[PDB]
Design a protein around this ligand. Structure first.
Ligand SMILES: O=C(c1cc(=O)[nH]c2ccccc12)N1CCN(c2cccc(Cl)c2)C(=O)C1
Ligand SMILES: O=C(c1cc(=O)[nH]c2ccccc12)N1CCN(c2cccc(Cl)c2)C(=O)C1
Lengths: 304, 304
């Protein structure tokens, strides 16, 4: 029992973190095989960031201007190229610690772990979700760029995120490992609007299922509702619409607890309409939406 | 910016996790040098746990009855001994992945990361605190015993906790790496009372400092208070008494924000007396007490 915001063990990713310096800018790189991946804004000076022309800035850079250091050892850069918003620096040495890996572009509402890094050294690991507005509520300071988000399936690391930016509002923006930003964000120091941050309904419900499994059942009522009735309430409270796919995905949680998905929907409807009345659910005084049904199942079954 | 419950990177500890089987019981072990540390209740059958006599149960066990498996390789057990509530199994091979390490007994209110494991394989990592009642609010399932809690100082892992038990209330009890339980708990399947779980006041204040640093400043008022006036309010709300040592420890946070510790105390006093009024602080609708002043400083400075 117990429910915590749990991250994947970071060992496989720690073995991939390197430092990338270009000019006066230092950030993190991801070394997999003989390629180091990093945000392309490593080639920018703080003056360039207002309106960078990355192709022109990159023309002035050669392989020897990219300093890549793995631990205390310097890697030799034999090639460099830009793929969307990431640079791929080909090095002469394959990372001996390269785990089995994939690059995946995740959907909003999906969760992943971040290994926050500074100067190629890992400082911490935390779990977060890709928000419906394509931002992440991370914890990143100066030099954290290049830090990655990932999931692990037994021994295969699916890298899904690379940190690039912090918006004026303190939320974070980044790309997948092919350099495509999640959202409408661009790697420019300009006024960028995040958009409405809605609540991931299927995740709140999965967390209500974990709460029931964990003995916290005060919020369960004698009511049911329909997908349409529920979604009328969900829209008013800036919650994502619940679809039949979400209901299907909650099936194992519904089967384990014996609580039909629509019955749990009615409990959530009353929690939204009446608030928590000073009470807590799983030690929280608000509805948590950064646990997918896969995360709840995993944390309540023991998958290593 | 951003504030998250951040754990230490778990790589150094993942390299130490092994599986320990004795009879029909399998749990996790910590392999450091040529010794595997594990809960002594690995020698108990589910019938023995009502009132085990560990010395007598241990007499019936020989080195060959302890199956230790590191990955898919079996380790040879050449010695076994009991130290308080832990078994120390001497193996013929030193762990090649042994990091620099120490064994430390932590104080209540101190935080640490847990690498939750099952069958010697790491499944997740999360951050928690040793509660003032010497329990931990973990997330552990069947087979999680032997999972460890640690802190990292650059390259030195200080192991502080080994998981042993789940109380009937769902909170967790365990020992330091010398086998001494934190609290009055005993490794027996018996009715054990946890005690009053008070709030770690110095940690709530450190988190209020992180909130101010992170732009969440609504709760700051025009008032101050005294250590004695504050503690009168703290006692009523089951908060730990704040001492001059706690005030000293908050010094760097007070210096960085320009807010005197007693002024922050008055803000917390009003938050306790009036509640949050439906508002949030760092994305939470309750006062968080599992971030020490060292954690807040570390997460707001970038220590790797
Ligand atoms: O290192 C950071 C940084 C990242 C972060 O998440 N939090 C911080 C908090 C305090 C100070 C700095 C940071 N930078 C430099 C690059 N950078 C940027 C600026 C413009 C465009 C692009 Cl793609 C990137 C940033 O956003 C800011
Ligand atoms: O593996 C677990 C377990 C640990 C846990 O933290 N959560 C669980 C949730 C569901 C089912 C089992 C568990 N056990 C076996 C040993 N055990 C025990 C019993 C008596 C004494 C001693 Cl020292 C230990 C337990 O408390 C329970």
């Amino acid at each position: 029992s117990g429910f915590r915001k749990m991250a994947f063990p970071s060992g496989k990713v720690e073995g991939c973190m390197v430092q990338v310096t270009c000019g006066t800018t230092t950030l993190n790189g991801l070394w997999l095989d003989d390629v180091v991946y990093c945000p392309r804004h490593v080639i920018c000076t703080s003056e360039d960031m207002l309106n960078p022309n990355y192709e022109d800035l990159l023309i002035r850079k050669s392989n020897h201007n990219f300093l890549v250091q793995a631990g205390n050892v310097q890697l030799r850069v034999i090639g460099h190229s830009m793929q969307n918003c990431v640079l791929k620096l080909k090095v002469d040495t394959a990372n001996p610690k390269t785990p089995k890996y994939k690059f995946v572009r995740i959907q909003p509402g999906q969760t992943f772990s971040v290994l926050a890094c500074y100067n190629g050294s890992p400082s911490g690991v935390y779990q977060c979700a890709m928000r419906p507005n394509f931002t992440i509520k991370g914890s990143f300071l100066n030099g954290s760029c290049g830090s990655v988000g990932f999931n692990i399936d037994y021994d295969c690391v699916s890298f899904c995120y690379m940190h690039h930016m912090e918006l004026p509002t303190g939320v974070h923006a980044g790309t997948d490992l092919e350099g495509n930003f999640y959202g409408p964000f661009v790697d420019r120091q300009t006024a960028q609007a995040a958009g409405t941050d809605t609540t991931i309904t299927v995740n709140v419900l999965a967390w209500l299922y974990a709460a029931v499994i964990n003995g916290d059942r005060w919020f369960l009522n004698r009511f049911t509702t329909t997908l349409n009735d529920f979604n009328l309430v969900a829209m008013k409270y800036n919650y994502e619409p619940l679809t039949q796919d979400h209901v299907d995905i909650l099936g194992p949680l519904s089967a384990q607890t014996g609580i039909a998905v629509l019955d749990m929907c009615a409990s959530l409807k009353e929690l939204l309409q009446n608030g928590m009345n000073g009470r807590t659910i799983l030690g929280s005084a608000l509805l948590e939406d950064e646990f997918t049904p896969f995360d709840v199942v995993r944390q309540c079954s023991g998958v290593t």
